[PDB]
Amino acid sequence: PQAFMSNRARGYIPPELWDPGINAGLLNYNFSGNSVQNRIGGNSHYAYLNLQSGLNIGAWRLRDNTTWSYNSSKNKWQHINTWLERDIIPLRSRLTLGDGYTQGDIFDGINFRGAQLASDDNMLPDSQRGFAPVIHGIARGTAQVTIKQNGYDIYNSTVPPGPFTINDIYAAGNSGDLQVTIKEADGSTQIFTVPYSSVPLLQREGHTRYSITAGEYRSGNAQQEKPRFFQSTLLHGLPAGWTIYGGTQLADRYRAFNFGIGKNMGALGALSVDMTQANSTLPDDSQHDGQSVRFLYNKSLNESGTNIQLVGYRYSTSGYFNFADTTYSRMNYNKRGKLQLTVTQQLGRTSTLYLSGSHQTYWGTSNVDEQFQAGLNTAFEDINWTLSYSLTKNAWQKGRDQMLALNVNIPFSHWLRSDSKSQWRHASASYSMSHDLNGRMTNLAGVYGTLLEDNNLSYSVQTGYAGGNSGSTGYATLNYRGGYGNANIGYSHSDDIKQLYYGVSGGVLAHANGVTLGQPLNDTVVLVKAPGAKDAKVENQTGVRTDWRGYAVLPYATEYRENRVALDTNTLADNVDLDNAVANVVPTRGAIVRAEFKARVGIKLLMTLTHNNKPLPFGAMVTSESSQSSGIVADNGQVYLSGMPLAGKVQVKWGHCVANYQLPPESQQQLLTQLSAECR
């Protein structure tokens, strides 16, 4: 049966096909400079240089980050983060020695310096990611199952006469209704429906996530100390829509244990309740024991796909502290209750009301932190207009703190024709109007778009008026994303302040085949190598072209996925023909994979060959050793060859021809040449 059969998920890639990468260096540079001129104090210069070095040897990936600052009066190199990451396939996890961060959701975000080992959800196929119910069933006889959503079908497959479990259902949003319909050739159809609502803490049935972190604690503040701590987090998906998740934080002075459950009740919604019990030592010698209970509720689609509600409550009793409170200085009011209420309502297929309300109460100080936000976005044809309102009454007498904003974006394509050849089609007009509900007014109108053939050079010119002061401000920027780097130039003009920004970003790879420059890198990169094909643009990317050696680096590549690297044959030299214009790679996290391409440099030839006044038979192989070229006879003895010399000979192996040919310089200059040559 299907349940016993080791069926694989949709989009599943075996771990053997995953490419570890290549042994190569790496250096990403980001230089920025600001010249600020004011009538009061003349002029000044600022320069910030971010340098991320790296080295990928074997499977280990070493990364180092450094910063340089120069003001106009000294040079200051400053380390930030160094880490040696790696991925372990048998454990389906990722290990990191050195600096890093704690991705804990059950606990609070912590920056640390030590060994971390955490399960990664990215290595799993995209089908079985997130939360989605798995379907268990018994089918009497051979059956056809059509797990179908309220809109359309999702999973259609055959099932043998036996138990079957289906776990390939996609996320399909936060809430959904799956109708399982089984049809057998003998009996009548059997249908049953199941609703589901998801919470980020929930996991799939039989899904396990873990995180083990150990090492010292680091923070930007110099007041806090650097204590060593251990943090373990576990998330498990029980059968029947439950989730059990726990955690443990431990240090010299702070010991906290977190336990929680979550449920997918179906039509009612989704729930997640957890309790954290902590014994802490304050900056002084005092010891405090406390608890904090967090509650999360997600309602299903109210009405008919109109309203969605989220309720997040958190009650922290007197004596519960996070890790920062303990790790404060040797000598340096808790939250009684925090409530979040989010309501989203969609109307007219266009307007989307978002209402957010946060309400926090402390201990002793009965002051209440209230935060009410109401946004309305509407996309009426090309015109997109958003109206937002916000209010914030905080504990420290922040008053009403009301704010209102109105942003309208109108593309020029609303007026220009569909097939306009002008560059004005790649542009839009933006208008922003901000009230502070006290007379403080900010208007800003401008245009922006792209004006290059690859849409690399992006321009944005905006004027604005600030009124109580009455200030007119101009702001014009140009960003160019070329095949060697990104260069941005900006000019901000004010009443008495003139700012000129100039920045260059780039990346350098010291791979085996020399040094390759390119756009700034983003974790995983693909090194496209097509030697002999100079200035060849790659597809689906902006301003990524090969250099004079044919080597280029792609900025971003999806990890553990099937992504296509294609060379745009249209914008390629007529003398060069690619044997393969599309390649497929499966990179690992933080890895450099070579998408090797073969390019023939000689002229493109179309030869009609005849033997004994008879065209060569179909399927015959024509090869030329003078320039290592090959082709297959199409019909009437017509064969296509790429990369051939002006004068030479070819040989045909139908099942042993030799054919001599010569071409004129006009033929060599032509794009594609056609000729005839007889066998021996």
């Binding site: 359309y152 399909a172 936060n174 976005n377 997109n384 922006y448 944005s460 920027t477 971003y556």
Partner: protein, 158 residues
């Protein structure tokens, strides 16, 4: 020979620690997702290849603001899928049952509400870049066409 006394010189100034805002040129941004096929987006939940883009901040100091995050405000195609954007209709023709989604450094989706902020980040002294990923999300079969969507993002400092 002779030493006499002049007047006085009065120096007027003010030492100020400056805050930070969005980098020039990163205010209005455009991202080209490329070309995707119905084979890639043929059923609900199918996602295309993510395209990276960064938001830059300049003149940020650790003392004034240790951490920062952003929140994207947009239009949802339906109340069920509130974490995906909505594509605008075009005269030539707009794709049906498809939208734009935004991810984080952790690979998690973002609620398009104006208050759901993303994960916190550490602010380096000066230039700071926050990366994000744009993706295609199909709710059912995706008819071919042109997909263009817009999103408004606001930044908070902690």
């Amino acid at each position: 020979a002779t030493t006499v006394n002049g007047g006085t010189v009065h120096f007027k100034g003010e030492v100020v620690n400056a805050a930070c805002a969005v980098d020039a040129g990163s205010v209005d941004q455009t991202v080209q997702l490329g070309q995707v096929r119905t084979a890639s987006l043929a059923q609900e939940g199918a996602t295309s290849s993510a395209v990276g883009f960064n938001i830059q901040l300049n003149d940020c100091d650790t003392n004034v603001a240790s951490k920062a995050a952003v929140a994207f405000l947009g239009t949802a195609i339906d109340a069920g899928h509130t974490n995906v954007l909505a594509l605008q209709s075009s005269a030539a023709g707009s794709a049906t049952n498809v939208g734009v989604q935004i991810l984080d450094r952790t690979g998690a989706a973002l609620t398009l509400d104006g208050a759901t902020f993303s994960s916190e980040t550490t602010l380096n002294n000066g230039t700071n870049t926050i990366p994000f990923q744009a993706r295609y999300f199909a709710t059912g079969a995706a008819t071919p066409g042109a997909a263009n969507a817009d999103a408004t993002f606001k930044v908070q400092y902690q």
